[PDB]
Amino acid sequence: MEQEKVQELVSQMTLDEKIAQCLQLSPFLFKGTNKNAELTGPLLQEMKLTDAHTENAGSVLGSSSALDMIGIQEAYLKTNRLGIPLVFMADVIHGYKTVFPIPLALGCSFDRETVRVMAEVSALEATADGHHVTFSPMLDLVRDPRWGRVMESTGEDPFLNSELGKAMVDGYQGDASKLNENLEQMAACVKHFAAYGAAEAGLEYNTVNMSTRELYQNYLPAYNAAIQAGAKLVMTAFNVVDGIPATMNKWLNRDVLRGEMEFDGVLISDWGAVAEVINHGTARNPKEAAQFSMEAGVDLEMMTTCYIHELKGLIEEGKLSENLLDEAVLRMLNLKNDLGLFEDPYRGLKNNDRTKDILTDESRGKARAAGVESAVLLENKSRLLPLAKEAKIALVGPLATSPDILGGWNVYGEEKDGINVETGLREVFETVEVVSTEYTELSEEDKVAVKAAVQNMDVVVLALGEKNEWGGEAGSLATIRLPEAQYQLAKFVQTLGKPVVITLFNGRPLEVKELAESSDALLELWFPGTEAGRVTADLLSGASNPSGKLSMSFPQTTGQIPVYYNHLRTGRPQTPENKGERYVSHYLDIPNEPFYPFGYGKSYSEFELKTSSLPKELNLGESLHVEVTIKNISDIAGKEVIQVYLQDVTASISRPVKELKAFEKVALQAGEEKTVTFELTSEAFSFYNHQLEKVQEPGLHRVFVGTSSEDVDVFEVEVGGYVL
Amino acid sequence: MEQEKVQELVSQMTLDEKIAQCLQLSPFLFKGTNKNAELTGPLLQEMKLTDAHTENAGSVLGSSSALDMIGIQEAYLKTNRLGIPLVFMADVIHGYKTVFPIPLALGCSFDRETVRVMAEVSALEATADGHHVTFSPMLDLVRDPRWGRVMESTGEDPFLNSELGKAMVDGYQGDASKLNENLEQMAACVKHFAAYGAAEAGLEYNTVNMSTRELYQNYLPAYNAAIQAGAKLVMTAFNVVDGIPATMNKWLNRDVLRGEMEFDGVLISDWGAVAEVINHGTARNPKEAAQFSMEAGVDLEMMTTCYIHELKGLIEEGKLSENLLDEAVLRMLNLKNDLGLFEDPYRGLKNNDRTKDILTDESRGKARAAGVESAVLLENKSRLLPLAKEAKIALVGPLATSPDILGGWNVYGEEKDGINVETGLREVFETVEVVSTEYTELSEEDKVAVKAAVQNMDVVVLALGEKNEWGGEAGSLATIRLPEAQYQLAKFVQTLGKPVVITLFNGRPLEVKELAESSDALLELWFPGTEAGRVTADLLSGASNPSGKLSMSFPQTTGQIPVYYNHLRTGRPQTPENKGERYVSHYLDIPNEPFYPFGYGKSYSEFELKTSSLPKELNLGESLHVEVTIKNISDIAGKEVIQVYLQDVTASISRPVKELKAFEKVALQAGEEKTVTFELTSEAFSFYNHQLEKVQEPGLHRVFVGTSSEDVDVFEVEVGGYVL
Ligand SMILES: [Mg+2]
Ligand SMILES: [Mg+2]
């Protein structure tokens, strides 16, 4: 509908209708839900919600199916005075029913098109089941693998996160101006604004603190990239940002998000985040939480009742302008209009059952393809991998038969539909003997069984990993290790005399030195999703060639954290020419380097790269064009991730030793040679200064081209002169 | 001498004289040195120092004795055109020749007079050997025990650190306006400005980043207290402060230190820190490092040559004003004048050998008394301790005979004069059987020997600990544990069936859970210094009753770091009533609490405290007066540390759940009752807001009175109304 009619709606709503429009509730709080209806009465009484509230609520979170949505929307539209339909939002993080790899695994793909496809299939299925918005992409920069929510991020680099974040928004939304027409696409919600990943000591919900300059340099750019790409919603964070809970942080939400970033869509709170500003100690009670969160521009309160019980009295008393409420209501109505809800409240589902679009073979192949792009081969000593299909496999460990391979933040996917590692391997390999063990125990009886299977077979596939419940939200581990029984298993297996490949399933970096050292090969599968066992079997057999690279550093030990590639030099850097000396930046007990670094991953192929002649000088404002020729010099087709880093050698702020500023994943047949070109615009040479200006300073830069943050050639370019 | 004569010297100096005045050198680079002459020739040539340089240098760093100083000062005044004497500075951190407990241990004293006395004895001795300045106190806030320099701080609380920092300054300097007269006192130098202890991942020299608000709230207050108390010098930090190395950080040093804190004394670089701004990537060469460090107001370059080689040219070219150089030279001369050097360049020694004042028995008693104030009794199950004098002791482990008990940052104290554990115990206990073991090994032969000693004796004193080289500067450990052999030893000893006291020597918080669980008693002696074994023997025997309290949190595990008592609440605090829920701030694998908290320590006595009726309301600006009556209800004389904390319940910034605002250590005979009073001024209720204003907000505060951050009675005070 026309914008005039939208605005007219706001004019016609009562104060109570406008207040309720800013409330989001679980489906079973509404009449006409088809699930959990025995929870309805108790919870409504406990939250003190009336019919007047639920019949005028703005939104539903977490509908259970198309039938829930239709049931609820239908009943809601019977009683709603002005006919303003509900918007339905959902947690579609890395797939709906077809589960794709966890986001941190998709980071390791270094593949924008993989991420777009994942988001596209996700939207196709989610919209089929009646959802209009997804709480994705998660764009929090992560440097602390203790935090369980690292599995939701694409990792430690703000550029990679920015690029994959745009890819995701594109896949979910397509052309954002046509979400009223394109009913298999859905709105995206950027989260969590801001800097939630910097939680102190990796403890869930814990304090975040950094300078404003560091906030702008590293923690804000991916949110911004996604917002500029057209993300329809933004979600507040649970953490403080410089002492003020994000949800009621007026500078953050009005000045930065709506002002500098020009965001004009719905700002939704995280779950209970409005009420929880009380717990943080920055509102005395629900009246203050309401006032402060509305002053900060939060339009939609997720499943708490500060707005509903408090806004009327704040507005009647003069403590809050009713204009702020109108602006909130207008953004809610505009989202709904963007989604086409005023013309079709069922968004394409009424008399059009799309059950058929969910969990198709094509979608499944897309998830397998995403898993084989995202896995990272970490060790492969002596061409153990790929295994011949006649290789006799002892498959042992807790991940041998476990169905827990879909990952965390899997709200709708079912383990019954997933492929476990044994099933996967039995499709490819004729001889497999299986010995499952428990995640946290290694019995005498287990060791006898393991010894017997290994003795029978020729190679060991040792499948280890985390339960998905050990990460995700409020899955903080102080010590980033598997259960000790797993490391003891890897040590035991090593003693049996046969080659060992460890296939590792997990949602965070872990201490894997003891694994690498106890095996011949190590393949990091993360959690690949629905097609996990086929992903594993294809990579092991070489049907697919590993091509992922780490998007997050793997520390030597828990106490190295935070460790990350884009770090400052310090006044006393360790150099090859001072190593051994006391008075340099080092630890007494471990290396400075992480166990594996950013951008690292192996392949069954071998590649040679060469960079075309670059200029020695550049003007201010001028781009550097970087041409790279890459040849596959082996007999095995595969993919390499070309990476380009820049360094600012001297600056008015100490700058990182490297920052990723371009990447492309190149597929090459045996012998095949391609040339790829990168433009590093003057923005790539710029940074935030002490006064928080975005600046380019004349001076020396290094340019690094290669295949990890360590395997690079280096070139120097002197920036100066006049500005273009 | 008169100020007009000081100003006149500046007017008369050549530019080359002025530039060299801003240089500090090791003693052996001066003619007249009486040690390390063999080092002089090569080092002069590598630094490209000539006689016009050394005969005009401003200061000496680390003279080895009174004779070195005299020889150096005599030779230099033969050749110095204008007669400007050298100022001699040294590292007197917790004692000169009589070594007191390490600063972290003095923090655990919670005793201002103990710290004052340590600094007084240190000055008595240091001045007797010809030093004019000490590079103490170290006032860096510490929350990360990986960092080896925690041993130099008084811990994680800015209030405690503030109070003991003032006590040290008062102890070294006395009345600072009479340093030309009181030649047994010396100038103090606050260090390291600023925020060096926040080194990321506890890695030496590594990145520091925090919000400006946090910097003011927690990281600057102790430096400020010591500056306000009259500290003569300040030293720059090695780390970046919001991206800019502190040494050339103009905002920090000009605006904050000289402007806001009104510091008008010498700003000395840390070692090489002027040249190292190059390494940090914020100066291209020595010419820029010099410019920027002089613009930031650094007056004295410690052992690098940026100033001496580049200033003349920067001044001649007009890139740098000669006025900044004159200001530096004037501060350097004012310092020398404050020390009386223009009337007596030898500061009391030239006709007065004060060898007599060094390592006196009186001073050794003060060091013992400081050790028994500072140890912390952590466990004492079944009144194992105190031991009777006739107890038959098996003394075993790496600390049974090690002479390494004087601590890190012991530049001048000698182990031959210290008292090891065996020696201390044999002065008190008639029956001691000793079995020494290595710091990092536990052999079969050791076990046989330990088992035999234990079989013969009735109790085990298991003496464990760190080598001092495992901490201090560039002594970072990624895992805060002793060598695994020591934990294996404690496990072994526990099997022998006799009661065990572990006496632990160390410079940082360690993971001690396994030690607490493997023993009946645990006594944290840190490194007590010269009288270490006597301190140990008195506490074990009850001649002294332990009275120390932790000034830094002891983590459950390395991965809990940072953990500290003055933390924010978060949006989802763990409460005793949401125990067991997933969606709260917690770890899956450990408690949120540290193993032991701030302000905890045991005693051989028992106390009861009672707080007198407090007001329910208070005006803004008004003090709260807190009166507490304490009684020793045991038969044993003892000291208890009464602590008072404040919490700001609701604020415009999320405030810590507690902060210490008053403490007093109270000595009580058996059955003795005392009353003490505390004034919490309105400044105790104040904090820095979003705009960096120091404010007091009306509202609810809680007041906590007790004997730890956990063992408290709580009271509520509503603050508002008018301002008083
Ligand atoms: Mg530059
Ligand atoms: Mg308050």
Side-chain angles (χ1 to χ4, degrees):
Chain A
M1 81 187 200
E2 317 301 336
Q3 193 56 40
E4 286 71 14
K5 288 170 285 170
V6 177
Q7 194 67 57
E8 203 162 348
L9 261 178
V10 184
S11 281
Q12 295 169 354
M13 285 167 87
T14 73
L15 187 45
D16 283 353
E17 285 168 337
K18 289 191 295 192
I19 294 167
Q21 187 65 199
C22 304
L23 172 74
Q24 187 183 66
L25 307 166
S26 286
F28 56 79
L29 295 167
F30 297 84
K31 177 192 157 79
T33 188
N34 77 328
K35 205 176 165 182
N36 291 307
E38 76 275 8
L39 304 177
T40 302
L43 190 56
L44 284 170
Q45 162 181 78
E46 171 175 15
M47 302 185 61
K48 305 131 137 48
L49 298 164
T50 62
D51 287 326
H53 300 146
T54 65
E55 285 169 19
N56 296 288
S59 182
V60 174
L61 155 114
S63 161
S64 70
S65 67
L67 247 59
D68 214 355
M69 180 276 178
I70 293 156
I72 290 158
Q73 189 65 297
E74 177 161 54
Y76 184 97
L77 282 167
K78 270 214 171 53
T79 65
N80 196 262
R81 184 182 69 88
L82 297 168
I84 304 168
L86 296 164
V87 52
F88 283 73
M89 308 211 190
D91 292 307
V92 197
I93 304 317
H94 56 101
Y96 192 73
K97 296 291 193 185
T98 305
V99 183
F100 280 71
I102 62 167
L104 187 54
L106 299 179
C108 299
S109 87
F110 280 73
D111 197 59
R112 300 160 172 93
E113 175 58 7
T114 297
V115 172
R116 190 200 65 80
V117 166
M118 177 280 291
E120 185 176 90
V121 169
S122 294
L124 166 76
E125 300 186 339
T127 59
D129 225 9
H131 309 295
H132 308 153
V133 182
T134 184
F135 302 132
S136 175
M138 186 273 207
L139 300 168
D140 305 329
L141 184 69
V142 294
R143 302 178 165 168
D144 190 343
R146 293 169 290 193
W147 194 47
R149 318 192 68 162
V150 294
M151 48 136 306
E152 302 159 59
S153 177
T154 57
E156 73 196 34
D157 182 58
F159 182 77
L160 183 60
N161 291 353
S162 289
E163 293 295 281
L164 304 185
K166 291 185 265 183
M168 267 201 221
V169 171
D170 184 26
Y172 289 129
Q173 295 199 165
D175 171 343
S177 68
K178 289 169 203 291
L179 279 162
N180 67 307
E181 300 173 359
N182 302 331
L183 307 195
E184 306 187 351
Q185 275 92 185
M186 74 194 306
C189 187
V190 170
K191 72 199 193 177
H192 308 85
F193 201 78
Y196 177 42
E200 207 151 83
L203 173 66
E204 194 62 78
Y205 314 116
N206 204 20
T207 304
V208 166
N209 186 257
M210 55 184 77
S211 70
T212 312
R213 183 193 50 77
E214 256 307 292
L215 178 70
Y216 278 86
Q217 184 72 49
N218 293 310
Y219 283 83
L220 288 181
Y223 314 110
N224 179 69
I227 286 162
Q228 307 314 333
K232 288 283 183 189
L233 293 75
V234 174
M235 183 182 285
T236 71
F238 288 131
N239 49 290
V240 297
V241 171
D242 207 356
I244 303 173
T247 301
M248 59 163 275
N249 182 328
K250 179 185 191 166
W251 169 80
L252 180 77
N253 294 345
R254 303 279 184 183
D255 299 355
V256 184
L257 177 60
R258 298 204 186 274
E260 299 173 359
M261 289 186 191
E262 301 185 326
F263 182 62
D264 194 43
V266 171
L267 186 56
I268 191 176
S269 72
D270 205 335
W271 186 296
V274 169
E276 286 168 18
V277 311
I278 304 151
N279 295 331
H280 276 283
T282 61
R284 180 169 202 160
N285 49 39
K287 183 182 217 178
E288 289 189 355
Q291 184 191 322
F292 304 157
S293 301
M294 175 73 62
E295 287 176 342
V298 172
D299 303 316
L300 187 60
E301 171 172 14
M302 187 181 289
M303 275 295 279
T304 48
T305 59
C306 293
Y307 277 2
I308 203 84
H309 297 321
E310 304 289 347
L311 291 171
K312 183 174 230 170
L314 288 164
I315 286 172
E316 287 188 340
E317 274 152 44
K319 293 149 177 64
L320 204 72
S321 182
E322 186 165 357
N323 297 316
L324 296 184
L325 174 67
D326 291 349
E327 297 162 18
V329 172
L330 187 62
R331 290 188 292 257
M332 282 293 289
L333 302 182
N334 284 341
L335 168 56
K336 295 179 159 182
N337 202 31
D338 291 341
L339 285 165
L341 297 188
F342 291 109
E343 285 79 54
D344 182 11
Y346 297 104
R347 200 152 183 273
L349 293 207
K350 216 50 142 114
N351 336 279
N352 170 41
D353 181 336
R354 303 184 43 218
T355 296
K356 180 168 48 199
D357 292 333
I358 296 179
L359 205 51
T360 64
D361 282 12
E362 190 180 7
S363 291
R364 289 181 83 121
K366 285 160 177 168
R368 190 196 313 204
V372 312
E373 296 285 326
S374 305
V376 180
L377 180 69
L378 290 177
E379 298 291 351
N380 186 16
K381 299 173 219 166
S382 286
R383 243 82 146 149
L384 173 55
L385 303 179
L387 304 183
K389 319 219 311 138
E390 67 279 2
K392 298 160 48 57
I393 302 182
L395 170 67
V396 321
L399 268 287
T401 63
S402 178
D404 192 4
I405 43 57
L406 307 180
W409 278 111
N410 171 35
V411 174
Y412 294 95
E414 315 174 58
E415 288 187 349
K416 74 162 181 58
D417 309 320
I419 314 287
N420 77 354
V421 171
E422 187 185 355
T423 298
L425 289 202
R426 284 194 197 282
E427 296 179 351
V428 172
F429 303 99
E430 51 200 328
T431 308
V432 191
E433 295 196 7
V434 177
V435 181
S436 182
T437 58
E438 308 286 344
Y439 279 84
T440 67
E441 300 293 5
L442 179 53
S443 70
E444 292 306 308
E445 181 186 4
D446 291 334
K447 289 189 185 175
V448 169
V450 171
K451 185 138 160 37
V454 184
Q455 270 169 176
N456 295 338
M457 302 285 99
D458 301 333
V459 295
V460 185
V461 174
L462 182 52
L464 298 182
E466 298 182 295
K467 298 189 168 163
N468 89 68
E469 69 187 87
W470 300 344
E473 179 181 3
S476 292
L477 284 182
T479 295
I480 50 150
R481 287 181 65 83
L482 293 173
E484 194 58 18
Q486 297 195 39
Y487 291 101
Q488 292 159 1
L489 178 55
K491 192 198 298 151
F492 177 72
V493 161
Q494 196 277 326
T495 75
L496 304 184
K498 307 273 180 99
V500 183
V501 49
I502 289 172
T503 52
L504 181 70
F505 301 82
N506 50 307
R508 51 163 56 81
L510 290 162
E511 303 178 15
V512 301
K513 176 176 186 166
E514 288 161 45
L515 303 178
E517 293 186 354
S518 285
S519 63
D520 310 286
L522 173 63
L523 171 68
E524 168 62 279
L525 284 138
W526 301 106
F527 284 132
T530 297
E531 293 298 303
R534 306 203 167 109
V535 175
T536 307
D538 294 351
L539 294 163
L540 291 180
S541 76
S544 303
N545 185 359
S547 58
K549 297 299 194 178
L550 292 177
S551 68
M552 196 170 192
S553 296
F554 269 53
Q556 297 281 338
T557 195
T558 289
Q560 200 178 42
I561 290 171
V563 63
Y564 51 83
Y565 86 95
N566 60 335
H567 61 82
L568 310 187
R569 196 149 186 266
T570 83
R572 298 180 167 201
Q574 210 192 37
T575 68
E577 306 69 53
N578 68 27
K579 209 174 162 190
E581 292 195 17
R582 170 77 177 204
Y583 291 108
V584 303
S585 182
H586 74 292
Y587 292 98
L588 300 171
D589 54 340
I590 59 160
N592 285 18
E593 291 84 2
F595 191 69
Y596 296 125
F598 183 88
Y600 171 70
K602 293 186 67 68
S603 164
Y604 303 150
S605 305
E606 202 189 351
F607 298 96
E608 231 140 53
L609 294 67
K610 58 185 78 230
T611 297
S612 306
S613 219
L614 300 162
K616 297 319 194 172
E617 293 199 293
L618 213 52
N619 290 125
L620 300 151
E622 182 180 359
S623 302
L624 187 71
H625 293 278
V626 180
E627 179 180 67
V628 186
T629 306
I630 184 174
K631 189 175 222 284
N632 182 344
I633 68 176
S634 79
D635 309 314
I636 308 294
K639 296 164 179 218
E640 188 51 284
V641 186
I642 306 179
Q643 299 149 48
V644 183
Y645 301 80
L646 222 44
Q647 174 185 18
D648 194 341
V649 171
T650 313
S652 67
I653 296 294
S654 185
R655 304 273 295 119
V657 296
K658 298 183 164 61
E659 305 182 301
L660 190 65
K661 298 298 183 178
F663 62 96
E664 170 169 345
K665 183 166 222 188
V666 183
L668 287 162
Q669 289 293 313
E672 177 172 17
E673 180 184 291
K674 305 192 164 152
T675 287
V676 297
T677 64
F678 303 105
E679 190 178 356
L680 300 190
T681 69
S682 75
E683 182 188 14
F685 288 79
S686 298
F687 65 100
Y688 289 97
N689 74 13
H690 166 244
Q691 210 159 323
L692 308 176
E693 301 166 315
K694 190 86 178 290
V695 308
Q696 183 184 11
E697 296 176 338
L700 186 68
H701 295 250
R702 305 183 177 113
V703 184
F704 312 78
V705 184
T707 62
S708 83
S709 54
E710 289 295 313
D711 294 342
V712 289
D713 287 339
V714 64
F715 308 111
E716 278 170 15
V717 52
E718 184 75 33
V719 188
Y722 54 85
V723 195
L724 286 198
Chain B
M1 72 181 191
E2 303 94 325
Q3 193 58 37
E4 302 75 17
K5 298 202 173 280
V6 175
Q7 196 59 56
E8 159 191 70
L9 271 168
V10 183
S11 315
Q12 293 179 332
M13 290 170 77
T14 69
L15 178 62
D16 290 327
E17 284 172 343
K18 291 197 282 192
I19 293 167
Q21 190 64 196
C22 305
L23 178 67
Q24 184 177 69
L25 303 172
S26 289
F28 52 90
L29 302 168
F30 291 92
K31 160 193 142 43
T33 189
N34 81 324
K35 198 191 163 163
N36 294 133
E38 81 280 349
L39 296 184
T40 305
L43 190 57
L44 288 171
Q45 297 342 291
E46 151 170 78
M47 295 187 67
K48 321 193 287 139
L49 297 157
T50 66
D51 287 329
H53 294 143
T54 60
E55 292 160 15
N56 295 289
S59 174
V60 179
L61 183 89
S63 174
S64 61
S65 68
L67 271 50
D68 211 359
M69 184 272 285
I70 296 152
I72 291 173
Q73 186 74 290
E74 197 147 13
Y76 184 102
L77 295 163
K78 287 205 211 272
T79 55
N80 192 257
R81 190 179 64 88
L82 299 174
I84 304 168
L86 292 150
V87 54
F88 283 77
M89 312 199 194
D91 293 317
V92 194
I93 307 312
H94 55 106
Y96 191 70
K97 289 279 176 200
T98 309
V99 185
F100 285 67
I102 60 167
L104 189 53
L106 301 174
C108 300
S109 88
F110 284 67
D111 196 60
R112 294 166 174 90
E113 177 59 11
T114 294
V115 175
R116 192 209 58 81
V117 170
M118 176 280 296
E120 178 172 279
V121 173
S122 297
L124 166 76
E125 293 188 344
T127 60
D129 229 4
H131 308 295
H132 309 149
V133 184
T134 180
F135 301 129
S136 166
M138 188 278 201
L139 298 171
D140 308 331
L141 189 68
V142 290
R143 294 180 170 172
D144 190 344
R146 290 172 289 194
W147 194 54
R149 318 192 70 165
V150 293
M151 52 132 301
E152 297 161 60
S153 182
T154 61
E156 75 193 32
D157 188 61
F159 184 65
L160 187 61
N161 293 355
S162 297
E163 295 292 284
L164 308 176
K166 296 187 276 174
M168 287 199 207
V169 174
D170 180 33
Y172 290 132
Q173 299 200 157
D175 179 349
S177 69
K178 301 183 188 273
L179 277 167
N180 55 353
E181 286 170 29
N182 304 330
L183 317 189
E184 296 180 359
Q185 317 285 180
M186 76 202 299
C189 184
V190 174
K191 63 190 200 183
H192 307 82
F193 203 80
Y196 180 36
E200 200 153 88
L203 175 57
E204 197 57 84
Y205 320 112
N206 200 16
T207 306
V208 166
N209 185 259
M210 70 272 296
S211 73
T212 311
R213 188 188 48 70
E214 271 300 302
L215 180 73
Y216 280 88
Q217 189 64 52
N218 292 307
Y219 288 78
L220 292 179
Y223 310 115
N224 184 64
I227 292 160
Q228 296 330 313
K232 286 278 182 194
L233 296 75
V234 177
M235 178 184 287
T236 73
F238 292 133
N239 46 289
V240 291
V241 175
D242 199 6
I244 304 171
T247 297
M248 63 164 276
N249 182 333
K250 312 181 141 79
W251 168 81
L252 183 68
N253 298 335
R254 298 287 186 182
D255 297 353
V256 180
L257 171 64
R258 296 204 194 265
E260 300 172 0
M261 289 183 187
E262 314 194 12
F263 175 66
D264 187 41
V266 167
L267 182 65
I268 186 179
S269 84
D270 205 335
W271 184 294
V274 173
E276 290 170 10
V277 310
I278 298 164
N279 292 332
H280 277 282
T282 63
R284 193 173 184 156
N285 51 39
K287 188 162 178 189
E288 291 187 352
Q291 191 189 323
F292 305 157
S293 295
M294 178 68 74
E295 288 164 350
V298 176
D299 298 325
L300 184 55
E301 181 171 10
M302 186 182 291
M303 276 297 285
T304 50
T305 60
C306 297
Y307 280 176
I308 196 71
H309 298 325
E310 309 283 353
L311 291 181
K312 184 181 64 153
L314 289 161
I315 286 174
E316 285 181 348
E317 285 152 25
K319 302 171 165 48
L320 199 71
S321 181
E322 192 174 359
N323 301 328
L324 293 187
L325 177 62
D326 295 3
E327 287 156 21
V329 162
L330 183 55
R331 299 189 280 269
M332 278 290 293
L333 310 178
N334 288 340
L335 170 52
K336 289 163 167 190
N337 201 29
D338 296 342
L339 286 162
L341 295 182
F342 293 106
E343 292 78 49
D344 180 10
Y346 303 94
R347 213 147 180 280
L349 300 197
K350 182 66 168 177
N351 309 118
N352 180 37
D353 185 305
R354 298 183 44 222
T355 304
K356 187 107 79 181
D357 286 349
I358 295 181
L359 202 63
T360 67
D361 290 0
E362 207 194 340
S363 287
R364 301 176 73 121
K366 288 155 183 185
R368 189 174 181 175
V372 320
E373 293 289 324
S374 295
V376 183
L377 183 67
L378 296 174
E379 306 281 352
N380 189 20
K381 299 180 232 159
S382 300
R383 318 189 179 277
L384 174 55
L385 298 185
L387 305 181
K389 288 198 276 195
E390 73 274 358
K392 302 179 77 186
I393 300 177
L395 169 63
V396 310
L399 273 279
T401 72
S402 185
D404 187 7
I405 43 62
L406 303 184
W409 278 114
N410 164 47
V411 183
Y412 293 98
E414 295 170 86
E415 281 177 2
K416 70 172 182 62
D417 311 310
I419 310 298
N420 75 359
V421 182
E422 179 179 3
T423 302
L425 288 199
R426 286 193 191 284
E427 289 178 349
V428 165
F429 302 96
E430 27 163 12
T431 316
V432 194
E433 200 150 307
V434 184
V435 181
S436 178
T437 59
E438 310 284 346
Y439 277 87
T440 68
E441 302 289 5
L442 180 57
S443 71
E444 295 309 298
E445 178 183 9
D446 289 336
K447 287 182 190 175
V448 166
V450 168
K451 175 194 286 242
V454 187
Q455 260 164 196
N456 304 338
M457 296 293 98
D458 300 329
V459 299
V460 186
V461 168
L462 180 58
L464 302 182
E466 295 187 298
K467 296 183 159 168
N468 86 66
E469 74 196 45
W470 299 345
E473 186 185 355
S476 289
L477 295 180
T479 300
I480 56 147
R481 285 175 69 85
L482 299 171
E484 184 68 10
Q486 295 193 37
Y487 289 108
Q488 288 158 357
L489 183 56
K491 183 174 135 204
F492 182 68
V493 165
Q494 192 273 328
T495 78
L496 307 177
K498 307 235 175 149
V500 180
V501 185
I502 286 169
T503 47
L504 181 71
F505 300 81
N506 50 302
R508 50 156 62 73
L510 292 159
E511 303 180 11
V512 300
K513 179 180 177 157
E514 291 158 47
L515 301 172
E517 291 180 353
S518 279
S519 66
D520 304 282
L522 173 68
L523 184 62
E524 170 64 281
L525 280 314
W526 300 111
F527 291 126
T530 300
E531 294 294 293
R534 296 184 176 130
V535 169
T536 303
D538 299 349
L539 296 161
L540 287 178
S541 78
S544 307
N545 181 0
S547 71
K549 301 297 197 182
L550 295 177
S551 70
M552 197 174 189
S553 290
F554 268 55
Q556 299 280 344
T557 189
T558 292
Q560 204 176 36
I561 294 171
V563 58
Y564 48 91
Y565 83 95
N566 58 328
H567 61 82
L568 302 184
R569 191 148 189 272
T570 87
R572 307 180 159 195
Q574 205 190 47
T575 61
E577 70 263 21
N578 65 28
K579 193 181 76 189
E581 295 181 21
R582 167 77 175 209
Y583 291 110
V584 302
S585 183
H586 75 292
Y587 293 93
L588 296 183
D589 58 338
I590 61 171
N592 290 13
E593 297 80 11
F595 193 71
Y596 296 127
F598 179 89
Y600 171 80
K602 300 179 63 59
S603 165
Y604 302 153
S605 308
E606 218 200 331
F607 306 94
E608 66 176 349
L609 291 65
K610 170 60 158 187
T611 297
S612 316
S613 210
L614 289 165
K616 174 63 220 211
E617 306 203 74
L618 207 49
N619 288 113
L620 296 155
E622 172 166 34
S623 302
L624 175 86
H625 286 281
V626 175
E627 185 184 66
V628 177
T629 299
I630 181 167
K631 190 168 201 221
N632 189 337
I633 65 169
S634 66
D635 295 315
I636 314 318
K639 291 178 202 202
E640 185 50 284
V641 182
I642 301 174
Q643 304 151 49
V644 188
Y645 303 81
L646 261 202
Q647 180 184 11
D648 190 350
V649 177
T650 312
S652 62
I653 296 296
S654 176
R655 304 268 300 119
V657 294
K658 297 183 168 63
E659 297 180 309
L660 190 68
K661 308 287 179 178
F663 62 93
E664 195 183 320
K665 191 170 226 185
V666 184
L668 294 164
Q669 291 298 303
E672 187 180 9
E673 194 179 75
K674 289 187 174 163
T675 300
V676 282
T677 55
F678 298 106
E679 186 180 354
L680 307 193
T681 67
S682 80
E683 195 280 333
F685 291 82
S686 302
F687 67 98
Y688 288 94
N689 74 5
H690 172 271
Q691 327 185 301
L692 317 166
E693 300 172 326
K694 192 77 164 292
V695 305
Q696 191 188 5
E697 295 175 341
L700 183 64
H701 293 257
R702 297 180 184 118
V703 186
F704 306 86
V705 183
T707 52
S708 85
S709 58
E710 290 296 315
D711 296 341
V712 291
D713 285 330
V714 61
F715 299 112
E716 289 188 357
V717 187
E718 186 75 28
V719 183
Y722 54 93
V723 180
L724 199 127

